[PDB]
Design an enzyme around this catalytic site. Sequence first.
Site, PDB file in Angstrom:
ATOM      1  N   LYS A 116       0.806  -1.220   0.000  1.00  0.00           N
ATOM      2  CA  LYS A 116       0.000   0.000   0.000  1.00  0.00           C
ATOM      3  C   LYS A 116       0.843   1.277   0.000  1.00  0.00           C
ATOM      4  CE  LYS A 116      -4.431  -1.708   1.660  1.00  0.00           C
ATOM      5  NZ  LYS A 116      -5.356  -1.853   2.814  1.00  0.00           N
ATOM      6  N   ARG A 168      -6.841  -2.437  -6.796  1.00  0.00           N
ATOM      7  CA  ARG A 168      -6.763  -1.289  -5.888  1.00  0.00           C
ATOM      8  C   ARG A 168      -5.325  -0.989  -5.477  1.00  0.00           C
ATOM      9  NH1 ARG A 168     -11.467  -3.592  -3.980  1.00  0.00           N
ATOM     10  NH2 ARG A 168     -10.450  -4.581  -2.176  1.00  0.00           N
ATOM     11  N   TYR A 201      -6.418 -13.138  -3.461  1.00  0.00           N
ATOM     12  CA  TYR A 201      -7.290 -12.209  -2.741  1.00  0.00           C
ATOM     13  C   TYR A 201      -8.651 -12.101  -3.433  1.00  0.00           C
ATOM     14  CZ  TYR A 201      -2.589 -10.903  -1.135  1.00  0.00           C
ATOM     15  OH  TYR A 201      -1.296 -10.939  -0.660  1.00  0.00           O
ATOM     16  N   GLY A 248     -15.275 -16.668   2.028  1.00  0.00           N
ATOM     17  CA  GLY A 248     -15.611 -18.076   2.111  1.00  0.00           C
ATOM     18  C   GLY A 248     -14.395 -18.947   2.313  1.00  0.00           C
ATOM     19  N   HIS A 249     -14.666 -20.227   2.537  1.00  0.00           N
ATOM     20  CA  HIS A 249     -13.629 -21.242   2.623  1.00  0.00           C
ATOM     21  C   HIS A 249     -14.079 -22.478   1.852  1.00  0.00           C
ATOM     22  CE1 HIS A 249     -11.035 -19.094   5.467  1.00  0.00           C
ATOM     23  NE2 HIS A 249     -12.160 -18.616   5.962  1.00  0.00           N
ATOM     24  N   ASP A 250     -13.189 -23.463   1.753  1.00  0.00           N
ATOM     25  CA  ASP A 250     -13.434 -24.705   1.007  1.00  0.00           C
ATOM     26  C   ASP A 250     -14.875 -25.211   1.132  1.00  0.00           C
ATOM     27  OD1 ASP A 250     -13.673 -27.779   0.977  1.00  0.00           O
ATOM     28  OD2 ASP A 250     -11.707 -27.545   0.035  1.00  0.00           O
ATOM     29  N   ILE A 251     -15.345 -25.386   2.367  1.00  0.00           N
ATOM     30  CA  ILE A 251     -16.668 -25.969   2.607  1.00  0.00           C
ATOM     31  C   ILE A 251     -17.780 -25.208   1.871  1.00  0.00           C
ATOM     32  CG2 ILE A 251     -17.144 -24.744   4.821  1.00  0.00           C
ATOM     33  CD1 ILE A 251     -18.402 -27.394   5.840  1.00  0.00           C
ATOM     34  N   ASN A 252     -17.637 -23.889   1.768  1.00  0.00           N
ATOM     35  CA  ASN A 252     -18.631 -23.072   1.069  1.00  0.00           C
ATOM     36  C   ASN A 252     -18.639 -23.315  -0.433  1.00  0.00           C
ATOM     37  OD1 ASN A 252     -17.469 -20.858   3.432  1.00  0.00           O
ATOM     38  ND2 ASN A 252     -19.639 -21.478   3.447  1.00  0.00           N
ATOM     39  N   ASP A 292     -10.024 -26.491  -1.918  1.00  0.00           N
ATOM     40  CA  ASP A 292      -8.721 -25.818  -1.852  1.00  0.00           C
ATOM     41  C   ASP A 292      -7.685 -26.442  -2.770  1.00  0.00           C
ATOM     42  OD1 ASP A 292      -9.626 -24.004   0.014  1.00  0.00           O
ATOM     43  OD2 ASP A 292      -8.491 -24.859   1.688  1.00  0.00           O
TER      44      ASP A 292
HETATM   45  C1  LIG Z   1      -7.276 -21.556   5.032  1.00  0.00           C
HETATM   46  C2  LIG Z   1      -8.174 -22.597   5.237  1.00  0.00           C
HETATM   47  O1  LIG Z   1      -8.094 -23.346   6.376  1.00  0.00           O
HETATM   48  C3  LIG Z   1      -9.313 -22.955   4.255  1.00  0.00           C
HETATM   49  C4  LIG Z   1     -10.315 -24.046   4.663  1.00  0.00           C
HETATM   50  C5  LIG Z   1      -9.494 -22.333   3.004  1.00  0.00           C
HETATM   51  O2  LIG Z   1     -10.428 -22.678   2.278  1.00  0.00           O
HETATM   52  S1  LIG Z   1      -8.398 -21.100   2.384  1.00  0.00           S
HETATM   53  C6  LIG Z   1      -9.384 -20.401   1.037  1.00  0.00           C
HETATM   54  C7  LIG Z   1      -9.991 -19.051   1.410  1.00  0.00           C
HETATM   55  N1  LIG Z   1     -10.638 -18.410   0.275  1.00  0.00           N
HETATM   56  C8  LIG Z   1      -9.945 -17.804  -0.693  1.00  0.00           C
HETATM   57  O3  LIG Z   1      -8.721 -17.744  -0.709  1.00  0.00           O
HETATM   58  C9  LIG Z   1     -10.758 -17.191  -1.810  1.00  0.00           C
HETATM   59  C10 LIG Z   1     -10.211 -15.824  -2.231  1.00  0.00           C
HETATM   60  N2  LIG Z   1      -9.880 -14.965  -1.099  1.00  0.00           N
HETATM   61  C11 LIG Z   1     -10.796 -14.371  -0.329  1.00  0.00           C
HETATM   62  O4  LIG Z   1     -12.001 -14.476  -0.523  1.00  0.00           O
HETATM   63  C12 LIG Z   1     -10.273 -13.517   0.807  1.00  0.00           C
HETATM   64  O5  LIG Z   1      -8.886 -13.209   0.559  1.00  0.00           O
HETATM   65  C13 LIG Z   1     -10.446 -14.142   2.208  1.00  0.00           C
HETATM   66  C14 LIG Z   1     -11.924 -14.348   2.519  1.00  0.00           C
HETATM   67  C15 LIG Z   1      -9.706 -15.472   2.314  1.00  0.00           C
HETATM   68  C16 LIG Z   1      -9.868 -13.202   3.258  1.00  0.00           C
HETATM   69  O6  LIG Z   1     -10.582 -11.967   3.256  1.00  0.00           O
HETATM   70  P1  LIG Z   1      -9.875 -10.605   3.742  1.00  0.00           P
HETATM   71  O7  LIG Z   1     -11.055  -9.416   3.901  1.00  0.00           O
HETATM   72  O8  LIG Z   1      -9.102 -10.856   5.013  1.00  0.00           O
HETATM   73  O9  LIG Z   1      -8.795 -10.267   2.591  1.00  0.00           O
HETATM   74  P2  LIG Z   1      -9.059  -9.603   1.144  1.00  0.00           P
HETATM   75  O10 LIG Z   1     -10.625  -9.032   0.918  1.00  0.00           O
HETATM   76  O11 LIG Z   1      -8.633 -10.589   0.085  1.00  0.00           O
HETATM   77  O12 LIG Z   1      -8.073  -8.337   1.134  1.00  0.00           O
HETATM   78  C17 LIG Z   1      -6.700  -8.455   1.478  1.00  0.00           C
HETATM   79  C18 LIG Z   1      -6.228  -7.094   1.966  1.00  0.00           C
HETATM   80  O13 LIG Z   1      -4.878  -7.228   2.416  1.00  0.00           O
HETATM   81  C19 LIG Z   1      -4.070  -6.258   1.748  1.00  0.00           C
HETATM   82  N3  LIG Z   1      -2.696  -6.760   1.541  1.00  0.00           N
HETATM   83  C20 LIG Z   1      -2.323  -7.982   1.090  1.00  0.00           C
HETATM   84  N4  LIG Z   1      -0.981  -8.098   1.029  1.00  0.00           N
HETATM   85  C21 LIG Z   1      -0.495  -6.931   1.451  1.00  0.00           C
HETATM   86  C22 LIG Z   1       0.890  -6.447   1.611  1.00  0.00           C
HETATM   87  N5  LIG Z   1       1.962  -7.217   1.317  1.00  0.00           N
HETATM   88  N6  LIG Z   1       1.023  -5.190   2.067  1.00  0.00           N
HETATM   89  C23 LIG Z   1      -0.044  -4.414   2.366  1.00  0.00           C
HETATM   90  N7  LIG Z   1      -1.326  -4.813   2.236  1.00  0.00           N
HETATM   91  C24 LIG Z   1      -1.603  -6.046   1.790  1.00  0.00           C
HETATM   92  C25 LIG Z   1      -4.774  -5.978   0.436  1.00  0.00           C
HETATM   93  O14 LIG Z   1      -4.420  -4.694  -0.080  1.00  0.00           O
HETATM   94  C26 LIG Z   1      -6.227  -6.055   0.851  1.00  0.00           C
HETATM   95  O15 LIG Z   1      -6.634  -4.787   1.362  1.00  0.00           O
HETATM   96  P3  LIG Z   1      -8.005  -4.056   0.929  1.00  0.00           P
HETATM   97  O16 LIG Z   1      -8.171  -4.079  -0.574  1.00  0.00           O
HETATM   98  O17 LIG Z   1      -9.323  -4.825   1.661  1.00  0.00           O
HETATM   99  O18 LIG Z   1      -7.912  -2.452   1.476  1.00  0.00           O
END
Ligand SMILES: CC(=O)/C(C)=C(/[O-])SCCNC(=O)CCNC(=O)[C@H](O)C(C)(C)COP(=O)(O)OP(=O)(O)OC[C@H]1O[C@@H](n2cnc3c(N)ncnc32)[C@H](O)[C@@H]1OP(=O)(O)O
EC number: 5.1.99.4
Lengths: 355, 355
Positions: B57, B86, B79, B120-124, B151
């Site tokens: 950021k 953004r 993400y 969401g997560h895997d189950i969803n 996953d």
């Molecule tokens: C794990 C497990 O046990 C299981 C059973 C699974 O199924 S896993 C499968 C899970 N599903 C998926 O993976 C499906 C796809 N993923 C998702 O749906 C979401 O990522 C989840 C829901 C996983 C987390 O939601 P969330 O609201 O916490 O995250 P987000 O909406 O994506 O936004 C990330 C934010 O972090 C920031 N940022 C990142 N890096 C950096 C950095 N280096 N430096 C600075 N900033 C950084 C980004 O800019 C962003 O900021 P914004 O834009 O909001 O201002």
Amino acid sequence: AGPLSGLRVVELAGIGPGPHAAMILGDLGADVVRIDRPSISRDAMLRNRRIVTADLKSDQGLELALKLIAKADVLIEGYRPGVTERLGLGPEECAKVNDRLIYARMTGWGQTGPRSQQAGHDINYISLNGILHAIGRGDERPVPPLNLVGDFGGGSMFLLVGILAALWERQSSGKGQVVDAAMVDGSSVLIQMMWAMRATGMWTDTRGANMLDGGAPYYDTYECADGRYVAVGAIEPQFYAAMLAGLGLDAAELPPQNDRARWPELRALLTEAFASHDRDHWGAVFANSDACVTPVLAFGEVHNEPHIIERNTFYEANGGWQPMPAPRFSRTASSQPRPPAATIDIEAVLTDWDG
Amino acid sequence: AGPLSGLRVVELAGIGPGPHAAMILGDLGADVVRIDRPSISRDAMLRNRRIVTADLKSDQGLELALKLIAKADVLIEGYRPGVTERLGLGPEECAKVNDRLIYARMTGWGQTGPRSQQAGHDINYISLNGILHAIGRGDERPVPPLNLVGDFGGGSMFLLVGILAALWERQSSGKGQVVDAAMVDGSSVLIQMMWAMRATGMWTDTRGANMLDGGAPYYDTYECADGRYVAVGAIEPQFYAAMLAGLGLDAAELPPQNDRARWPELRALLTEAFASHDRDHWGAVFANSDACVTPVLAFGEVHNEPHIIERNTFYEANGGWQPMPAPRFSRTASSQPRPPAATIDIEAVLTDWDG
Ligand SMILES: CC(=O)/C(C)=C(/[O-])SCCNC(=O)CCNC(=O)[C@H](O)C(C)(C)COP(=O)(O)OP(=O)(O)OC[C@H]1O[C@@H](n2cnc3c(N)ncnc32)[C@H](O)[C@@H]1OP(=O)(O)O
Ligand SMILES: CC(=O)/C(C)=C(/[O-])SCCNC(=O)CCNC(=O)[C@H](O)C(C)(C)COP(=O)(O)OP(=O)(O)OC[C@H]1O[C@@H](n2cnc3c(N)ncnc32)[C@H](O)[C@@H]1OP(=O)(O)O
């Protein structure tokens, strides 16, 4: 039309992982030719194919197969180790006519080892590496996760990674090689997260008593008033809070989310809440929320779900719905799969392939 | 040392499928650089990486990320759709500095659609496409098959196929593209066999009442005298006959293998047979034959199984066992994975990559 347009694949007809890998290659645009034994398919797996017939144990059948293989990029076989060798279609024989060939060997147990000559199916391969033991409720014997984990996730998908990785290597080396894809290996890599967690005290060998196996009240299904189900996957505290908010439950009156000693109490409270209304009611309540609550749809209902419809995850082809190719590509998009067609002559393919 | 030696991958730190895909690329020889947020690792999944930190950021963090991406073959992000956009790291911005980049987008719901902004997560993801509904015993609510199907099998594995297929295409086109890997899509293709069988009357929507879900007495687990389990997978008639022979049961005294009306009777007879001795007795009786009977091992006992040992399916790391790379390659074999190491400076990677 997909990214694999131009890739030539010979598939020796088998069951389970081999045909699934060949299907995905075809889905993504590859030119796949399947050789089956003597004597229009209704099997939707086998889409994106040209089907030929050959007696590989005869002199003529072996000759025609080798001519086809000489012009191919990839060979897929899923028989017991030694089978293609005795046919005259082993890696060493194929190398004599085509050293650019990716020779992809799809098995459960692998090419060597004490079980390498042993018959088996998905359930057997996942029995030996700890996977099957970990699936199901704790108070019952293990339940097979269909054949999703051995045949496909840890089977065909690893064969595909191997094939495509070897093709990348070939761009520099100019040469092919043999890919040994064993379901017992691939499925172990598929479950690497659990092996990693076990090492740090984050996973136990107790079935049904962990965060992702049904043990956690916030990661499980719930039966609703109509006998249908929702899935809850609210792991992170902010998502869990949204789930409680929609159920109208006061957090101050509930056990802490991760107090495992009170998980049965928490589950009972969530059970009562979800049971108070039908499945589709919870869809309305949790609309556009990060609560991680979704309806558990039966196959027959999937085609009516708006998110499924709008993204064209499925297409309708004589018989029923079938999944569209995955994943998706922005520039070289995959076509809608061509349905199974009539068996054609092997010499007709050779004329096309210039062999 | 594996087939992907020389491939440069930038991984934007996430959870689940993204890190698993990056792991497998690293396993097979790729040069993987993971960018995490600023704030050594015990997580075995982060093997085969170089770890850097950057505040994406900030002006400086974004600039350094783009410099790294300008020299990469592949970018992995997991993400919500719009997040990288953004940040200034969207596909359109990356294309300005590197039009050869494979931009790999790993999500559950996909890039568009009514659910695409929902957590969401895997189950969803597997709840919405019929998969979860199909797993478990019939007299109870569905059980999650861990996070193996969304996953990994239908998630990371499809991201990998997309990445490697896009790299194949790049050789002729000279350019990359965007890969949209949604777990809801990938898992649907993973279960294509069931969609195919549903169309031909070979699979039903009734949970626990089919050939491969625990419904068949010849494709299920059985509890033995010691409370431990065997898996039976004897589908074909000759394998089924071998199982009956090992059990010392007279086929003439049993119902036919596929008389479903008498399946409860058949299961009761097989239950009594397996219950008469311990798991390891049946392990011995069926160690070498084609009966498709295997002991169901818990994670902790896997390392003692001869077939697992002799093929080196696992290696020891940090007090625990971890799976070796899969699949296997005859000429360019993968190395034993490098353990997680300390975070390094981002400028040190740029010096190495000449960016
Ligand atoms: C794990 C497990 O046990 C299981 C059973 C699974 O199924 S896993 C499968 C899970 N599903 C998926 O993976 C499906 C796809 N993923 C998702 O749906 C979401 O990522 C989840 C829901 C996983 C987390 O939601 P969330 O609201 O916490 O995250 P987000 O909406 O994506 O936004 C990330 C934010 O972090 C920031 N940022 C990142 N890096 C950096 C950095 N280096 N430096 C600075 N900033 C950084 C980004 O800019 C962003 O900021 P914004 O834009 O909001 O201002
Ligand atoms: C799907 C499903 O429900 C599930 C849940 C799964 O897990 S699926 C995963 C299952 N597991 C695996 O896939 C793992 C790997 N596969 C296997 O372990 C075995 O293939 C199984 C056990 C599947 C079948 O055992 P088998 O004894 O029936 O077969 P075989 O030992 O391989 O020998 C094949 C014979 O056929 C001949 N032939 C072939 N084509 C032609 C032709 N065109 N012309 C002429 N002949 C041809 C060969 O020459 C060979 O002859 P021989 O050499 O004996 O003289």
